[PDB]
C-alpha cells in the first residue's frame, strides 16, 4: 500500500479538534505560559502624563530668548514633584520621570548648561517638546494591547502590570490522562521478573506534558489483563480532555488490546512517512481524544513531539502556533539516508572559523539507543525523496525547544 | 570611562564558589535541576537477548534442511519459553520477547507462509538477524551522567532505564528581592501624584522562577532609611544573592546610596553598553548584591547578560558559560554609534531564498519595553562600529525561553 505524509496527518488531526473555553482568573506572577482568555484593553493611557526623560531643567522657551542666566525656582523629583510657585524668567531642576511643571515647553540636559552666580545659562539651542516624554505616546486607553490566544511570557505580563491590571482571565489547564500496558513493564526500585525491563516512555511523556503547561494524571502501569484495561480506558476517559497510551496498546497489530479500544471509540491507525517509526493511533472515546504512541522509545518520543504536542497547543487556545522554526545550513558530516521517509535524525549545531551555523552527527540513528537526543541540539529534518547527503550540501535543521 | 561587558562578567564570577548542599528527590520532580553526583549503572540494558520483530526464532541447520518446521513453542513479553525445542522445529516470538536457549536467527512474519506440516522460510536468513543483544545499550559498571549535569528530558527517562526511583541534586538557589520609590505603585490600586505601577519587580521574579530559583519577594519600600536598613538585613538574612530591581543609586549620591555603602563592600561601574550602563555589585554580610538600573529596557538587559550566568554558576551548573550567536546579513539599515556594544532587538525569518536574515522591531527607544514581543533575537552590535547598512553581516544571539 502507501504511506501517509507527516503534515497531511497532522493537518487531519486538527481539523476536527475545538479550543477549551473554560477560564479562570489569577493573579499575573502565576501566569508564566499560561493562554489569554480575552482581550486586555486598557483602563489607561501610558504614560499618564507628560514627564521628564532626562535629569535637568524644565524651562520656558521665552525665557530661553533672553540670554540672561535663569535662577532655580524649585526641584521636581518623581517621588515628590514641585508645586511651589514658578515666576518668570525661572526654571526648575527635574530628574527621570518627574511630571513636567505647570507650562513647562522642554527640558535640557544637566550637561548643555553652565552654572552662572545666581542662575543657569543654556549653550546649545533648545526645540520645542525636547527629552519630554507625552501622555499616551506609547498606548490609548481603550486600545487592545494583547488579543486572546496570546501566550504570555516575560515579555508580555509586566507590559499588562503597566496598566494597573492585577489578575488576568485564562484558559483552564488542558486535562491529560495517561499510563501503559504490559507484563514485562515493571516500577522503579522494584526488581526486575523474568523478562522485565523498566518503564521509561511514561516518564518521558509525564515531563514534557508538565513543562507544556498541561494537567497530568498519571495512572501507572496496567498488566495484560482484558479486564483491567478496560477499566483504565474508562477512568482516564472520565476525568479528561486528552488520553494516551506511552506504550503496550495496538497501533495497528490485531492483538487482544486492539479490540478493547475498537469497542469504546472510533480509532485510526495510520502508516507515517517518517523515520524513526511509522505506526500512529487517533481517535474519539466517549469524553475525550485518544493517542496511541509506538512502543520503542525514540519512536514514541519523536512521535508526541511531533504531533501530539501541536495538538495540545491549539486545544490550549493558542492562536500562534507551528512549534519552532526551520533553517537551512551546511553539514560537515556524512549522512546515510533512504528515500520514502522524512527522516528526523539528531545532530549537532555550532560554529565555524568564520561564524556561521554548521551541523554535525551524534553518531548512529537507530532506536536501539537514547543518548543522541542528551548530545545533540537538533533535529536535521531529511526530506521524504532524497538520499545520501555530502559533506558540503545544504540541509534544514530544527534547534530543540526547552524541552531538552 | 567605561568598563567593557566581558570584563565586568569575569570579574563577578572570579569572585563566587558554586553551591554543594544537596538533597535527594524522586525523578519526576527533577527538571531543571542539577545532577550533585555520577550515576553510575547497576544493570545491563537490554537485561537480556530479546526478539526486535513478531516472527519465529530458528536455527541455521534446520533452515538449510529447507523442509518446513512446525511450531514446538512460543515466547511472549514477559513469558519467554523454557519448553522443549526438538530438531526440526522452530519457536513462535513476538516484539521484546526474549530469544529461547541455543536460538541463532529471528525471521519476521512476512518472509513465511504457513504449510499444512509446519511454517516454510522463503528468504535468506542471516546469522544474528533480527536479535538485539544483551548491554548494546548500556554496560553494567559504566558512569552513565557526571555530577553537574542539568536534568531535562534527555537524561531523566534514561536514568529510570536503570531502576533509580530518585538522584541526589543540588539545593535550589535563594534570590532576595525588593524595590525601592514613593512613586511605585501596587496592581489593583489608585495612582496618586506622580505615580507609576511597579513593573520592574514583576520581570524579576518571572525570570528567576522559570530560571529555578527559589524567590523571596519582599515588595515595595517606601523612601525611607529606616526601611531600607531593614530590607536589606531581612534580605541578606536568608539568601544566596540579593537584587534591587530599581530605586536604589546606581551611582548617584542620595540617601540610598550611603545605605549601600554602610551595609557592605559596593561597587559602582559604568559599563560600555546601550541600553543603560551603570550597575551595582558588591558584597553584603552573607550574601552577594545585585544593583539594576531604573529603566525598564536597561534592568532587562542587564539582568539578562550579567545576572543570568551569575545565577547559573552559583547552581552548580558545568555546561558552558558562552552566548549561543551567529552571523547572518541584515535586511534592515541599523543606526548605531561607535563606543558602546549596543544589544538592538530585532526579527529572524527565513528568507524565500531559505537562509536566515534579520530585520529591525522598529524604534529602538529605550522609553518603551514592546520591542520585546516584536522581537525574538537581539542584535549584538560590536562596540566600535559605526552605522550598517543592508548586506552586512552582524552578530544576533536569539532570545531563550523566558521571551
Ligand atoms: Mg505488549
Ligand atoms: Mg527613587
Redesign the pocket.
Known sequence: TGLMSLDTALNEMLSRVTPLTAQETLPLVQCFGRILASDVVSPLDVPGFDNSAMDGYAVRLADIASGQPLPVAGKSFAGQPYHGEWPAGTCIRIMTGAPVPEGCEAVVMQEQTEQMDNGVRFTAEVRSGQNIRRRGEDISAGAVVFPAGTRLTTAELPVIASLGIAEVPVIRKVRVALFS????LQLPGQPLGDGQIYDTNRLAVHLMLEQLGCEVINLGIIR?DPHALRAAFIEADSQADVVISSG?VSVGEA?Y?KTILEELGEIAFWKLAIKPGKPFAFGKLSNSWFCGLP?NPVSATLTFYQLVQPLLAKLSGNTASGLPARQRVRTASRLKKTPGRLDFQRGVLQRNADGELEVTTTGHQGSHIFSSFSLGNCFIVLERDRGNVEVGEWVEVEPFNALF
Do not use: A, K
Open positions: 500496558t504490559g507484563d514485562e495484560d503496550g492483538d488490546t512502543g
